[PDB]
Structures are given as structure tokens and as C-alpha cells.
Amino acid sequence: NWLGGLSRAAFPKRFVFGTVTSAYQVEGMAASGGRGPSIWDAFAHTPGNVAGNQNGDVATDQYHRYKEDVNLMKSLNFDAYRFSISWSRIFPDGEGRVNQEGVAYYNNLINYLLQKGITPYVNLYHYDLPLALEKKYGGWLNAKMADLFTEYADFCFKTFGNRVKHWFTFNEPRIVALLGYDAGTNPPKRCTKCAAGGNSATEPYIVAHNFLLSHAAAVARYRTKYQAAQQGKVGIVLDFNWYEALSNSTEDQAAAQRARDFHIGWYLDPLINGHYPQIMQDLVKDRLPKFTPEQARLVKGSADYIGINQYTASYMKGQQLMQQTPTSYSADWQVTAVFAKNGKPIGPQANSNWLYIVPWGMYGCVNYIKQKYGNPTVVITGNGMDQPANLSRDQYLRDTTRVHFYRSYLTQLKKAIDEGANVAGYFAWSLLDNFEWLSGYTSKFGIVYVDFNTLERHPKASAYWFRDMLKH
């Protein structure tokens, strides 16, 4: 059957199914309703930065159309909606004055979701640092971010936490560190060679450390001030793509494990065990910041659940570990990514070149977290694939590749859960075609088609696949 035996009965009792967006990618009204600019507004308005010089000024205009979009998700039988609050829509300068019109928007959204029986899962941060904070403080390079983020988080807990019971602090701090401070291809565009300055060998580590410390500080504030009354939870969202040893050799097996440690262990070892992975300590040395005992104790156990964004997988080939002049976080791993084994590609690619369709990667990742980290509560916070630009409306709607993607990936997730993985929920990226960062509107991840000329929504075949799979 097109559901392939999947339904709510195939997953644990009370398992949560939702869709996910982020503020800058869907809201629009980027310079309206009192919102201050984010680093992404400045970046996207710079000629050459985004495909077609596009930006999120209008995006999907969810700001005006949110009731349509909530009605749609309810009609598709989802239980939950993961979205983010734009920091600069609440605090246009990142600190100080509150934008009441911004607060009203999120109140209206949260209330409508609850009216329609959809549980809000709310991210505080999704790449969209207030521009004012980047300029005044130097953003995530500055340890003062812990204080600034905590004050913002405190405001959100106070204002929305009587209703919102499932929070996430950050979305994929690894991607911020990698693209913003190693490769320098995302804001603030820092890297060793970059015009804005930087150092690809040091700054990604500083940035990651500050995300961990900021997460821990915000969670300590939630736990000491709000949790008794509100009785909600706070986690973090981490990207994790699967790495499989290219062969059963010692060097290849070591390579795959080293890659896992630099990718996900970078954050999970601090969050679960209170230290960075040993291999990062051994290889990165003085360039890896050291947690004080007090900080490690604040960071350890500071996530109520681990959000995982899971998309893809690759093979890893190793070599002899060697002494080398530091150049970048990326080069520090001393591995080679490989996308074919025994002459056959690991999987076909979706529209994004990095996204190889490999359903067994989902099992790989979930099983690995279960076995390595004491089976913490995991939520799959994003999973999906993209269509290319320039298709007809009907071609977008007939998304048979995406239907196959979800059926296969969800079957692999079911396999891991049936083997005992503590997975509490799953969220499809995305509800809607949206602004896909550097790809702008050239990459379509939605289960619902958005016509970017008229802004009309049209559910794709994959949306009706979910509706059928999720009927109560």
C-alpha cells in the first residue's frame, strides 16, 4: 500500500506528529509590524548572497495567513507545529524595548493553534540573530550572548509559557558555526580568507561553546524561575547526518566514529556527559574552549529532549592521524566523505546537492544516539527533501519522490523505535515551500506547494499521504 503499513498504530501511544517552519523562512513582514532587522535581513539584501537576489521580506506571508496554514495542518491530521519566534520581532534591538505588535502576533498564533488542537513546539532561535546584537557585541563570538539570550528567553517564558509547554533554545548551532565562521558562506560571513574577518580554525569552536553556555543559562533560568508553575520542557535542535565506515577496516571505522564525534558529539557529549568528545580534545587541543567544572555541571543534563534534524548519510574513509597545522574545523576531522561504495551511489540526490536520499541513515542516527548516550528522549525535529525550481504547479503537486522519501524514512524510524529507541515525536520539514536560505525560492521542501507569485497554498500528494497516515 502507498502507506506501506504505516499509521498511528505503527508508532508508540501518544507519539507526536507535526510539521516545521522557521520565522525568517515563512513569516514575511520582515521590515513591518515593528520587527527589527536580523543578520539574515542584511545578508539577503546584499546583491549576490542569495539565489536571484531573493530575500524573506514577504516569504510565504504566514504573518497574515497563519489561520489558513493552521487550518491546513489540522485538516492534514498533524498534532503539533514546530515554529520559531523571531528575536528581532520581539526585541527589535535584541535587548531593551519590547515590540508589542510582535508579541501580539505570537500570542495570536499560539492561541489559534491551541484553539485548533495543535500543540505548539517553539524554537527561540533559528539563525536570525538581531542585527543590533551582531554590531554591538560581535554576536556568538561574545560570551555575553549567554546573558543576552537568557533575558530574551526569560521574556518568552514569562509571556507565552503558561500556554507553550515544549520549547527549544537553538536550531543547529553546528551549521551556524560551520557556515557562519568556518566556510564563511552564511552570516556573519567570517572565515580565514573572508572580507568580514575571521579564523576558520578557532571561531567555530568559540561559537559552539557560546551556544552551549547560552543554552545552559536559559535552561537554568527556566528551571529555577518558571518550571514549577508552568511544568513545560526545554530542549535543543541538532543536525545529524549519518556516517557509515566505507569499509570494515580499522582506519575507516575510526574515521566514521571521528566524524560522528565532530558532527553530533560536539554538542551531545557536553549535553549528556558534561565534556567535549575525547577525540576533539585530543585533536583540537588549545583551540577547543574548556568548560569550568561549574559550567560543565550547568550544561550537563540541560536538555529535556534532543531534537534531531535528520536528512542524509555518507560513507567515511580514514587515513593515518597526523600532526598538521590547523586550518579549519572542517579539516580538523581528518576524514574523507565518500558517496559511493562498490561502484554504486549511496542514494540519489534531491534538489540540494548535499541531500542524498538514504533512508537507512535515519535508523543509523537514531540507533547510534540510543546506544551511545543512554537512550535520551529524542524528537525528530526536521526531515524532508526538496524539488527544484521552475516546475509547473501540477509537477510540484505530483511529488511521488517525496511520498517515497517519507514512507521509507519513517519505516526506518519505526525500525529504530521498535528496537527500543526513546523517540517521542517526528516533524516534517516543511509544512510549506519557503525561503531556503542561500537557495532562496529555488528549493521546494514543502508538503504544501506555495505559488510565490500569488501566495496560494496547494497541498501536494505528500500532504495527502500524511493526512491518510495520520487519521485518528
Ligand X SMILES: OC[C@H]1O[C@@H](O[C@H]2[C@H](O)[C@@H](O)[C@H](O[C@H]3[C@H](O)[C@@H](O)[C@H](O[C@H]4[C@H](O)[C@@H](O)[C@H](O)O[C@@H]4CO)O[C@@H]3CO)O[C@@H]2CO)[C@H](O)[C@@H](O)[C@@H]1O
Task: Give the interface with ligand X as residue ranges (CB under 6 A).
Answer: 1-2, 22, 25, 171-172, 175, 178-179, 183, 239, 241, 309, 311, 354, 382, 429, 436-437, 445, 461, 464, 468
304 is in the binding site of which of Zn ion, ligand X, none (Cβ under 5 to 8 A by kind)?
A: none
64 near Zn ion (CB under 5 A): yes
Question: Of the listed pieces 59-67, 196-204, 339-347, 353-361, which binds Zn ion according to CB under 5 A?
Answer: 59-67
Radius of gyration of the chain (CA): 21
210 is in the binding site of which of ligand X, Zn ion, none (Cβ under 5 to 8 A by kind)?
A: none
| C-alpha grid cell, residue 174 | 553546528
165 near Zn ion (CB under 5 A): no
22 is in the binding site of which of Zn ion, ligand X, none (Cβ under 5 to 8 A by kind)?
A: ligand X
Question: Of the listed pieces 35-43, 63-71, 105-113, 121-129, which binds Zn ion according to CB under 5 A?
Answer: 63-71
Question: Of the listed pieces 54-62, 67-75, 217-225, 316-324, which binds Zn ion according to CB under 5 A?
Answer: 54-62
67 near Zn ion (CB under 5 A): no
Q: Closer to ligand X at the Cβ: 42 or 175?
A: 175
What's the closest the beta carbon of residue 136 comes to ligand X, in angstroms? 25
151 near Zn ion (CB under 5 A): no
Q: Closer to ligand X at the Cβ: 291 or 315?
A: 315
Residues with Cβ within 8 Å of 245's Cβ and at least 6 positions away in sequence, in order, are: 252, 253, 255, 256, 315, 316
Residues with Cβ within 8 Å of 129's Cβ and at least 6 positions away in sequence, in order, are: 38, 39, 87, 94, 139, 140, 187
Residue nearest to Zn ion (CB): 64
57 near Zn ion (CB under 5 A): no
| C-alpha grid cell, residue 232 | 513545560
What's the closest the beta carbon of residue 155 comes to ligand X, in angstroms? 23
Residue selected from 4, 42, 61, 397 as contacting Zn ion according to rule CB under 5 A: 61
What's the closest the beta carbon of residue 104 comes to Zn ion, in angstroms? 16
Q: What is the 3-state secondary structure (H, E, C) of the chain?
A: CCCCCCCHHHCCCCCEEEEECCHHHHCCCCCCCCCCCEHHHHHHCCCCCCHHHCCCCCCCCHHHHHHHHHHHHHHCCCCEEEEECCHHHHCCCCCCCCCHHHHHHHHHHHHHHHHCCCEEEEEEECCCCEHHHHHHHCHHHCCCHHHHHHHHHHHHHHHHCCCCCEEEEEECHHHHHHHHHCCCCCCCCCCCCCCCCCCCCCHHHHHHHHHHHHHHHHHHHHHHHHHHHHCCEEEEEEECCEEEECCCCHHHHHHHHHHHHHHHHHHHHHHHHCCCCHHHHHHHHHHCCCCCHHHHHHHCCCCCCEEEECCCEEEEECCCCCCCCCCCHHHHCCCEEECEECCEECCCECCCCCCECCCHHHHHHHHHHHHHCCCCCEEEEECCCCECCCCCHHHHHCCHHHHHHHHHHHHHHHHHHHCCCCEEEEEEECCECCCCHHHHHHCECCCEEECCCCCCEEECHHHHHHHHHCCC
Q: Closer to ligand X at the Cβ: 26 or 141?
A: 26
222 is in the binding site of which of Zn ion, ligand X, none (Cβ under 5 to 8 A by kind)?
A: none
> From CA 221, how far away is CA 308, in angstroms rounded?
24
Within a 13 Å sphere around the CA of 32, how many CA atoms are in the beta-carbon half? Answer: 9
Q: Closer to ligand X at the Cβ: 17 or 137?
A: 17
What's the closest the beta carbon of residue 211 comes to ligand X, in angstroms? 14
Q: For residues 168 and 124, is the Cβ–Cβ distance under 8 A?
A: yes
Size of the site for Zn ion (CB under 5 A): 2
Q: Closer to Zn ion at the Cβ: 61 or 151?
A: 61
What's the closest the beta carbon of residue 62 comes to Zn ion, in angstroms? 9
What's the closest the beta carbon of residue 60 comes to Zn ion, in angstroms? 10
134 is in the binding site of which of ligand X, Zn ion, none (Cβ under 5 to 8 A by kind)?
A: none
64 is in the binding site of which of ligand X, Zn ion, none (Cβ under 5 to 8 A by kind)?
A: Zn ion
Residue nearest to ligand X (CB): 1
What's the closest the beta carbon of residue 231 comes to ligand X, in angstroms? 28
Q: How far from 77 is each of 72, 394, 428, CA to CA, in Å?
A: 9, 23, 13
Q: Closer to ligand X at the Cβ: 295 or 439?
A: 439
Q: Closer to ligand X at the Cβ: 286 or 394?
A: 394
Q: Closer to ligand X at the Cβ: 291 or 356?
A: 356
What's the closest the beta carbon of residue 429 comes to ligand X, in angstroms? 5
406 is in the binding site of which of ligand X, Zn ion, none (Cβ under 5 to 8 A by kind)?
A: none
| C-alpha grid cell, residue 134 | 551582531
Question: Of the listed pieces 64-72, 135-143, 263-271, 385-393, which binds Zn ion according to CB under 5 A?
Answer: 64-72
67 is in the binding site of which of Zn ion, ligand X, none (Cβ under 5 to 8 A by kind)?
A: none
Q: Closer to ligand X at the Cβ: 62 or 241?
A: 241
- Positions touching Zn ion (CB under 5 A) are 61, 64
